């Protein structure tokens, strides 16, 4: 009875206007987005009218701040529901995220992942349309510590921020390696410098055989290894809100931002896969991932899709018109630098970073078709971001032509093969997932 | 011709009123402070009327926020110049530090160490009195990353924050230990997870024989060791502002907040001693340190005093009326907790943390007498904070009685002995430094 | 692949509504402007809702302030990118230019040439359209000293203002004339009045054989002459921003406001020609000039056009409804004057100033067609401003009829002849530049 279509996309790092060019492929991408019931993208840029202060985010590539008019470029492109939890939503601080919320509400744009407190950032947003409703939840596993939102106490208010998916990594080492680490701790004098913390806490905070040194936790194992696990608090809370959202919407979509790689850059972290499985277990109809500037595999779990990374639907980092002083300080210069020259020198004039490689300039828009919560179709539309084009022209999305779409679909199928995912391929280069239903 | 007296003190963590009790010793402390030309303390608490949001500062003991009325308790006690750079000035964020600046300016209280940008936080404050002027500069080596203030760029404004004294620690390890660390990096799979960062940067960011892993830098040495060094940028900038301040004031006082211990908790970090020597080299008349909840040694360098830690002149952490939710979460509870019960359970009802030990409840107020920039006197006044008293009564300062003052002066002399500092002792328990001039 | 069209125009001094009349020629001008990708004009009037205070600008013809509704008359006419640097943007002071920026941003009108500081006034504005992007930079060589914008210092903010192109003029005189000037300096007693400036500076500021007297710099030469040179700071900075803008846009257009005449009123100043050559050397695709109330020549330099003066696309000075007191004081009167009567007496009731002469009421709209940065077409559309019409009807633009367009095109060709520019002429009176590409 209820038939709904949802368009998904990755990170949207838009800093300029004219997002949809006069190219018929870009206009067809816009027609595809406008033709669905819900089009979801994840705003990875702070829309600003001036409120806030730049935070030091050199580990995230610098501050990504743009004129608020870019919001109109998003909605006019066809997107209607925004996920806002990522490692850049706090680039202008708490004042910046409050201003972003104000801007989004003034334009009637439903959003999730950020709030005035932790609860508001964890809540789903309900987008209602004549055909039905979609609940969007947004979280991020990549962010600077302290940027997560906080709930109030009886005496103090909360803190504006993002919806966090924290995780801990543990280094498994052999007993001999462990004892060598303890010997390094003792002989260097590092242990001595915990003496006060010994007498105040009563015991060494490094001994919990487990160990904690250099801001990293080690554990004795038969063979060396590396494991990651989700924060139980965040996992349980996000799952609780997913279970809540299923009661109030036809479709529940969980968006997660995660740069964390697995054993190889193409594979997600183990904690992320556990998290996506948990989200589908609690009743989510789809899990859309992003973070990396490239595509990752697609997995069908309990007849629901998991897109571990859809890459970037928009990529205009080097075109931002506002570079902070701490970002400028990353490049030694004999004279003051303009933003474009700064970004040119930052990549060695295109010889480093994401420009020289092709996998960083392809993306994918999945269009999912559900009938009463059952996934009946999952079309895949490859997107070209303009690899090799000038910096001012690359990063704008368009439906890839047949050849490039076939190459992108091959990449996606290869990345999805370890999960047992199969893809039917159309003559135009688009495709769709093989379903069991 | 110009004769000036300056009273120094450590961290002032005031959260309640009635700072100066009806005890004649406390009133005599107030008379001592009011009797000098300048009385300097370092405000380690956010005075608030409601502006800002609590930041996660569990590593600093939680948020320390107090009613702005406590400012009147400081000035009425005799203090007239405030240093504000410490690990708690940003407990309410950038909005909180802006509100603190507004409150201090509305009450006519000169302050330094915080500003709307990095320059404003680095500037000295000039306190003018009929007898002459004092320039105060305030910085801190202990703070959460990102809390330092930032200067504007051509496109973006700065960021409100504190005046930073950053520093880096290096672990010297033998070549065999170094190779074991590299083997741990490789065999655990940690190196594999840098693969992307390898292809984007062109080289491994862990190889700079030096090494960088687990957020810590290691270097091959003949014998294991541990070294600390000041950030060259911060050292040079603070020295430049000290040289600037000498041109515009009779006396220049540099206040530094530093929890960092040396080989033993009583000794300062090597970087801190280098910093104090540099400050006196650039023309500072005194360097007053704080951070630890206990006293550290006193050193005479080029006939100028360096108080590495004056402890706390006020210590009312457990009496704060505003505990954040993230601070409450540090204590498991079967029911919601009130602030006092939270602090009681936080210390195991007085069996842990700073309460059981005496060195945490003594302090020192030095009164320095300069004549045309030459240190002619340096009286030491021991301060009792009420060890063993109830939690609501301990932490308020008073001039210690003869016995306790003698014990405190003995402690200070023992802590100062490695620097060659000698102290003459009065019959009342007070004393003064032996000078060469 | 990339094909873009840009419409250019001169100064837009609009003070009334109904800018596009019901005349089919005016509607065809509007259709021409709306039909291009970018239509650039230079707003020479302060749009005001009441913010600011009139500055004394009697040397610029008085204050030119208009109701902000005139902005809607500009955009509805077809213009989409505004240059704002001219000798009238500061007619309401710094508050006035801030209000103008607010008004332009509220209406979504891209602008350049003014900012809250010097950098913001020097930045290009990027207008994005489905077919591509255009970068506009705006500066002015005519303005009251002090009206240029200023950048902040570590202690003080900047100053809102215009983007300046300063220049210095030097009078070459023979050695005998030079010595006569020095003798006039000495014998009149003018040199004596520099005595204090002699003892404070250490040397006479008039002796730098060069000389500086009467606010003018003289230099000994074999034959008397007159030279002008650009300010090196402004030239280098504007060129730097042009080089920056080329990296981020398909087309870069530099708009310059300059009243300064050369040896004859029809010829530009030497500094202006050097500046335009420099702009094209740095990568500008076109240089559009304005300032004089008449047309100047067109020059093709390195296959890029330089329009030294496009005159006025709108000229409604005498129709302004707000005349300042200092402007009223320019006309002696027996009774208080209304604005229209003031402007009538100011021109001797049409017998003086710009009204009696025809070259002041013709203009030109060039439509340039670029293909991947290469100029492929440059159509010229003569514009009639209504010479001889009543004052309330003249100044509104319309496409000139065949006869008047032929006369205007002849004028433009004659003014362009010294630069080697040739023009093909259509049957309707319009034309296009002869290109080498
Ligand atoms: Ca990201
Ligand atoms: Ca502290
Ligand atoms: Ca003018």
Short mmCIF file of N, CA and C in Angstrom, two decimals, chain A residues 9 11-14 17-30 33 41 73 77 79 312-316 361-365 382-386 393-400:
data_model
loop_
_atom_site.label_atom_id
_atom_site.label_comp_id
_atom_site.label_asym_id
_atom_site.label_seq_id
_atom_site.Cartn_x
_atom_site.Cartn_y
_atom_site.Cartn_z
N UNK A 9 23.09 9.94 -0.55
CA UNK A 9 24.35 10.50 -1.03
C UNK A 9 25.30 10.63 0.15
N UNK A 11 29.00 12.81 1.61
CA UNK A 11 29.28 14.11 2.19
C UNK A 11 29.11 15.21 1.15
N UNK A 12 28.50 16.31 1.56
CA UNK A 12 28.22 17.44 0.68
C UNK A 12 29.05 18.63 1.15
N UNK A 13 30.23 18.80 0.55
CA UNK A 13 31.15 19.88 0.91
C UNK A 13 31.04 20.97 -0.15
N UNK A 14 29.97 21.76 -0.05
CA UNK A 14 29.67 22.79 -1.03
C UNK A 14 30.10 24.15 -0.48
N UNK A 17 28.32 28.60 -5.52
CA UNK A 17 27.02 28.51 -6.14
C UNK A 17 27.08 27.75 -7.45
N UNK A 18 25.96 27.75 -8.16
CA UNK A 18 25.87 27.02 -9.42
C UNK A 18 26.18 25.55 -9.27
N UNK A 19 25.67 24.92 -8.21
CA UNK A 19 26.00 23.53 -7.93
C UNK A 19 25.58 22.62 -9.08
N UNK A 20 24.41 22.86 -9.65
CA UNK A 20 23.92 22.12 -10.81
C UNK A 20 24.23 22.95 -12.04
N UNK A 21 25.16 22.48 -12.86
CA UNK A 21 25.57 23.21 -14.05
C UNK A 21 24.54 23.05 -15.16
N UNK A 22 24.80 23.71 -16.29
CA UNK A 22 23.96 23.57 -17.47
C UNK A 22 24.21 22.26 -18.22
N UNK A 23 25.14 21.44 -17.75
CA UNK A 23 25.37 20.13 -18.34
C UNK A 23 24.10 19.29 -18.22
N UNK A 24 23.62 18.67 -19.30
CA UNK A 24 22.43 17.81 -19.19
C UNK A 24 22.59 16.69 -18.17
N UNK A 25 23.81 16.23 -17.92
CA UNK A 25 24.00 15.19 -16.91
C UNK A 25 23.74 15.72 -15.50
N UNK A 26 24.19 16.94 -15.21
CA UNK A 26 23.91 17.54 -13.91
C UNK A 26 22.42 17.83 -13.74
N UNK A 27 21.77 18.35 -14.79
CA UNK A 27 20.33 18.56 -14.72
C UNK A 27 19.58 17.24 -14.54
N UNK A 28 20.08 16.16 -15.14
CA UNK A 28 19.44 14.86 -14.94
C UNK A 28 19.67 14.35 -13.52
N UNK A 29 20.82 14.65 -12.92
CA UNK A 29 21.01 14.33 -11.51
C UNK A 29 19.99 15.08 -10.65
N UNK A 30 19.78 16.37 -10.95
CA UNK A 30 18.79 17.14 -10.21
C UNK A 30 17.39 16.57 -10.40
N UNK A 33 17.04 13.53 -8.25
CA UNK A 33 16.85 13.84 -6.83
C UNK A 33 15.45 14.38 -6.56
N UNK A 41 21.25 14.05 2.02
CA UNK A 41 22.68 14.31 1.93
C UNK A 41 23.17 14.75 3.30
N UNK A 73 21.60 26.19 -2.66
CA UNK A 73 22.14 25.32 -3.70
C UNK A 73 21.84 23.85 -3.42
N UNK A 77 19.08 21.62 -5.59
CA UNK A 77 19.59 20.44 -6.27
C UNK A 77 18.67 19.24 -6.12
N UNK A 79 17.93 17.83 -2.72
CA UNK A 79 18.02 17.26 -1.38
C UNK A 79 17.00 17.91 -0.46
N UNK A 312 31.88 11.63 -1.67
CA UNK A 312 31.39 13.00 -1.65
C UNK A 312 30.45 13.23 -2.83
N UNK A 313 29.25 13.72 -2.54
CA UNK A 313 28.38 14.17 -3.61
C UNK A 313 28.79 15.56 -4.08
N UNK A 314 29.39 16.36 -3.20
CA UNK A 314 29.98 17.65 -3.56
C UNK A 314 31.33 17.75 -2.88
N UNK A 315 32.33 18.25 -3.61
CA UNK A 315 33.70 18.35 -3.09
C UNK A 315 34.32 19.65 -3.58
N UNK A 316 34.15 20.72 -2.79
CA UNK A 316 34.68 22.03 -3.12
C UNK A 316 35.50 22.59 -1.97
N UNK A 361 37.16 11.18 -7.03
CA UNK A 361 36.28 12.07 -7.78
C UNK A 361 35.14 11.29 -8.43
N UNK A 362 34.78 10.15 -7.85
CA UNK A 362 33.59 9.41 -8.22
C UNK A 362 32.71 9.25 -6.98
N UNK A 363 31.41 9.16 -7.21
CA UNK A 363 30.46 9.01 -6.11
C UNK A 363 29.31 8.13 -6.58
N UNK A 364 28.33 7.93 -5.71
CA UNK A 364 27.20 7.07 -6.02
C UNK A 364 25.96 7.60 -5.32
N UNK A 365 24.87 7.71 -6.07
CA UNK A 365 23.56 8.05 -5.51
C UNK A 365 22.68 6.80 -5.60
N UNK A 382 25.92 6.08 -10.65
CA UNK A 382 27.27 6.64 -10.50
C UNK A 382 27.29 8.13 -10.80
N UNK A 383 28.12 8.85 -10.06
CA UNK A 383 28.23 10.31 -10.14
C UNK A 383 29.67 10.67 -10.45
N UNK A 384 29.87 11.55 -11.42
CA UNK A 384 31.19 12.04 -11.79
C UNK A 384 31.41 13.41 -11.17
N UNK A 385 32.56 13.58 -10.52
CA UNK A 385 32.92 14.84 -9.88
C UNK A 385 33.95 15.63 -10.68
N UNK A 386 34.32 15.17 -11.87
CA UNK A 386 35.21 15.93 -12.73
C UNK A 386 36.68 15.75 -12.43
N UNK A 393 36.29 23.96 -11.36
CA UNK A 393 35.23 23.21 -12.03
C UNK A 393 35.01 21.81 -11.47
N UNK A 394 36.00 21.23 -10.81
CA UNK A 394 35.85 19.89 -10.26
C UNK A 394 35.21 19.94 -8.88
N UNK A 395 34.46 18.89 -8.55
CA UNK A 395 33.72 18.80 -7.31
C UNK A 395 32.23 18.98 -7.46
N UNK A 396 31.77 19.54 -8.58
CA UNK A 396 30.34 19.63 -8.83
C UNK A 396 29.83 18.31 -9.39
N UNK A 397 28.71 17.79 -8.89
CA UNK A 397 28.27 16.45 -9.29
C UNK A 397 27.46 16.46 -10.58
N UNK A 398 27.57 15.35 -11.30
CA UNK A 398 26.75 15.10 -12.48
C UNK A 398 26.66 13.59 -12.67
N UNK A 399 25.55 13.14 -13.26
CA UNK A 399 25.42 11.73 -13.59
C UNK A 399 26.50 11.34 -14.59
N UNK A 400 27.31 10.35 -14.23
CA UNK A 400 28.43 9.96 -15.07
C UNK A 400 27.94 9.36 -16.38
#
